[PDB]
Design a protein around this ligand. Sequence first.
Ligand SMILES: Cc1cc2nc3c(=O)[nH]c(=O)nc-3n(C[C@H](O)[C@H](O)[C@H](O)COP(=O)(O)OP(=O)(O)OC[C@H]3O[C@@H](n4cnc5c(N)ncnc54)[C@H](O)[C@H]3O)c2cc1C
Ligand SMILES: Cc1cc2nc3c(=O)[nH]c(=O)nc-3n(C[C@H](O)[C@H](O)[C@H](O)COP(=O)(O)OP(=O)(O)OC[C@H]3O[C@@H](n4cnc5c(N)ncnc54)[C@H](O)[C@H]3O)c2cc1C
Lengths: 487, 486
Amino acid sequence: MSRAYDLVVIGAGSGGLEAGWNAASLHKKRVAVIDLQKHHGPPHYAALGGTCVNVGCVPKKLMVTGANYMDTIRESAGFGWELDRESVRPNWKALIAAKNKAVSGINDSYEGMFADTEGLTFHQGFGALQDNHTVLVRESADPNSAVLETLDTEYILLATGSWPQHLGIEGDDLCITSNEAFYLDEAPKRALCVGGGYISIEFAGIFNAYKARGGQVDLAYRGDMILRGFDSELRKQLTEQLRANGINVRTHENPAKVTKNADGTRHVVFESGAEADYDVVMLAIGRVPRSQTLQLDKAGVEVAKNGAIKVDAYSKTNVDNIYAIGDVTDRVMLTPVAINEGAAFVDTVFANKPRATDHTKVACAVFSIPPMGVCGYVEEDAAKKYDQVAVYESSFTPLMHNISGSTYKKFMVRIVTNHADGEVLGVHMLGDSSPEIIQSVAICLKMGAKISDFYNTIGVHPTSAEELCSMRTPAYFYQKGKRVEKI
Amino acid sequence: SRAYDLVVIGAGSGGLEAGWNAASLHKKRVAVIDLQKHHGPPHYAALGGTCVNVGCVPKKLMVTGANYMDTIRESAGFGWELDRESVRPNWKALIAAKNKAVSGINDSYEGMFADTEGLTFHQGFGALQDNHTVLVRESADPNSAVLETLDTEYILLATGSWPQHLGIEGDDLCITSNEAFYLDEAPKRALCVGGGYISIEFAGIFNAYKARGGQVDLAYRGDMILRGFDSELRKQLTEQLRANGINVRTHENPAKVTKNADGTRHVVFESGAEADYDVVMLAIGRVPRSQTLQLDKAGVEVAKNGAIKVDAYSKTNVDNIYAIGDVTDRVMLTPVAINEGAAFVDTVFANKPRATDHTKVACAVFSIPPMGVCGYVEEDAAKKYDQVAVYESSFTPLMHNISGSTYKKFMVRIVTNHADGEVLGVHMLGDSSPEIIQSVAICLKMGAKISDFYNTIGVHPTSAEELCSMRTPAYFYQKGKRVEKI
Ligand SMILES: Cc1cc2nc3c(=O)[nH]c(=O)nc-3n(C[C@H](O)[C@H](O)[C@H](O)COP(=O)(O)OP(=O)(O)OC[C@H]3O[C@@H](n4cnc5c(N)ncnc54)[C@H](O)[C@H]3O)c2cc1C
Ligand SMILES: Cc1cc2nc3c(=O)[nH]c(=O)nc-3n(C[C@H](O)[C@H](O)[C@H](O)COP(=O)(O)OP(=O)(O)OC[C@H]3O[C@@H](n4cnc5c(N)ncnc54)[C@H](O)[C@H]3O)c2cc1C
């Protein structure tokens, strides 16, 4: 045309593909999506479908599902299931092969999508900017490589995601990150997860279920407690449940130096001086916005210090026809948020239905064993926003577990309210099914539920979630930031 | 004045709520009567009620156990190697573990009466001599020994319900869920008669614990199991029941049951079909247990079937006699019984009249896989509103590509009033739907409309996030008539 394409998307991931397909399918726009690869795995790891499909949500969940069988096969003994317990063994190679066929199945569906959505096209290569109206598809991330394509477009959407952060330390190249974790051929007998975030804890559980019999999994983390940013009672009890299933949680610990040993194992010396030896050292310390090879200065797009592309409520940049979504904008790095921003962008730009994504009261899960589901503010946050805050709590060991022998499995729910009017500002739980229970709780929190709304619903019995409906009396309060006990 | 403020007959889910709140909160003298102090034969229930003893608590423990059959099966896909021909379910170990759990709850209740001043337990069959005198006797027989007499200002009858029997010959050789909890061996061939949640729940428990060559038959008169639930989910669940090995026999009803020389029972079906089974469990319905209470000499009205007629506030036609829970036959679930017990104590001793909302009650079926349901079924909703829109999803979770249980479809169906978008009912089939529905009911009590579901951001990867993903109706009921175009 007077512009060959309507939109060029860089990144065929969660947001990118939502954006790309609705603009084409619903609005009949000519959309080009660029990505580095068509199927998961090395060298790029992510591919069509993004990080979540390929080296993220979907494979980690199957791998956590697989890991959960260590506890359910142990637990069947208390309900009468007799089996030769000595014969039980995990097979990591069997897991990675089924995960690999599941993930490649998805990859093949996306190809089909493009095949029958007129106006939608996959362009493979490294996307980079020439100016706000020309996108280059290059052979490599290097600015000097052969340009394969030069796409002239009206609108540019940048949806390139995140990448694993590294440690500055000597030996970093002898460490893997979650990307490689998915493709290991043998499960580590001893593994060090470093970081205290959800990817670290989730991977500590997987390695723990699949390790060989004298194995050990350590999780090292700089802070005082893992999962900073979560409810602190929940973070204390998940540390105890983790410990109870054998992960050695070593807080205030950080790698100093990693050295290759003769046999292959790595030798970590910790900043404390402490040193040990592991098959695998996996760094899960952070995820950084992946903006650096796009040549954003060619179009003049502004980025933050950490690389986040700065965007307004509507995801637009400081260049009027360039928008950005997902992890590269560094707001809430979760797939369903990337998708939502993906959809709000097409309503705004092509459907003149201007929406901004609401990044408040976004629920999320940690698929540790046992998992967590969390939504809204933590009481220390609430205590510096509200005047009168009430904290309701409840703790119990599912009766099941007095029969299965994992008596350490306390289900726990913490509700944080604004005590002036009873509106629920946060709901935090630890225990099985909590990922599933919290979905619909977020529906209540977006509606503006009060604690009355919760204790007046008749419970479904016998369930864990019926605790939600039984917390009538506050456990303690915060009169103006200070933990009070009567308000 | 009277010796007692309240005499509760039936120390179950409703009555223990009612007696402990009136004593502990209001400082009343409450006398609570039950037939025994510990679960088990001969009366099965005991202090704590049918749920604690021969109900929700044991059954859920037995379903959780039944479920390991599926998870040890399914673990192979994720790389767990096991000597799979060594796996044997042991019933006696299940029942024992169950019995140890229930007895400990029974002992909690010993403790509760020990420290609540004013609450006491009196053991025997309670029966009415007039509207201020309750008599505790040795047995249901009117001419049995009167162990003690209680003079009271109010009476609350919370006596529950009991298995419905089939009038056929051989009915004396069928068991019901009461005896199912106390069986010695797993039945290898079991017949579960009934299309309801108890029938389907026990068929799934027997299917997992039976001996290797066995079979569970689920027989029902109707056309499809689980009358009252969403039809599509009744349709889907039957397949998944069959896929795990249950011979589901619809349009079937025992006509006659006889004993065989080895004490297996022989059933002659109304179809002329014939079959032998170790156990024939009648789970055809629950009937209000009002018949031994001598309600007639206190002038109390019962319905045809035996429900004690009570108004919104659980008050009978006799001003100081109330009845709550199953015996009133409003919604026979435990949290409703409990709720009515607290409402009654507010109405009578706090004089804050409350009445129980029996309208948007969520309920779960702990079948394999389970169900979580709440609100209107589209057929009912379409009778009340003339623009209903039905939304629906089903997907097989990826886990189940890898586990091999590819028959396990998760399914959610939302029924709305299309005019305002108010959500009238949410119906789910699949694992965790009991848990997910609890919070869906909170939404539904607060008046959630469908845009509230889909404007929420999803928690990925979970089945629950499908709730937030339905923007388009599948069809509609225009003025009672189904239409897919309004
Ligand atoms: C181990 C792990 C676990 C996770 N678990 C969860 C979970 O359970 N739930 C959840 O919601 N979130 C989870 N996430 C995060 C989730 O993956 C992301 O929020 C989501 O994928 C971000 O969407 P996005 O659109 O920003 O980018 P992505 O899906 O990251 O899209 C990135 C895409 O851009 C491509 N790309 C990059 N540079 C270029 C270029 N120059 N040219 C062309 N293409 C390029 C990448 O190859 C490509 O796949 C997890 C992530 C990890 C790593
Ligand atoms: C097999 C089965 C499974 C169930 N599963 C569930 C479930 O998972 N969830 C759920 O919510 N509900 C379930 N229910 C139903 C639930 O058990 C009942 O709705 C509930 O317990 C009834 O409460 P109630 O207070 O009316 O009476 P109950 O709890 O039945 O209490 C009855 C009490 O009355 C006593 N009694 C009777 N007559 C007399 C008398 N003359 N004198 C003295 N004592 C007397 C009984 O012995 C006694 O325990 C289940 C029921 C059954 C049987």
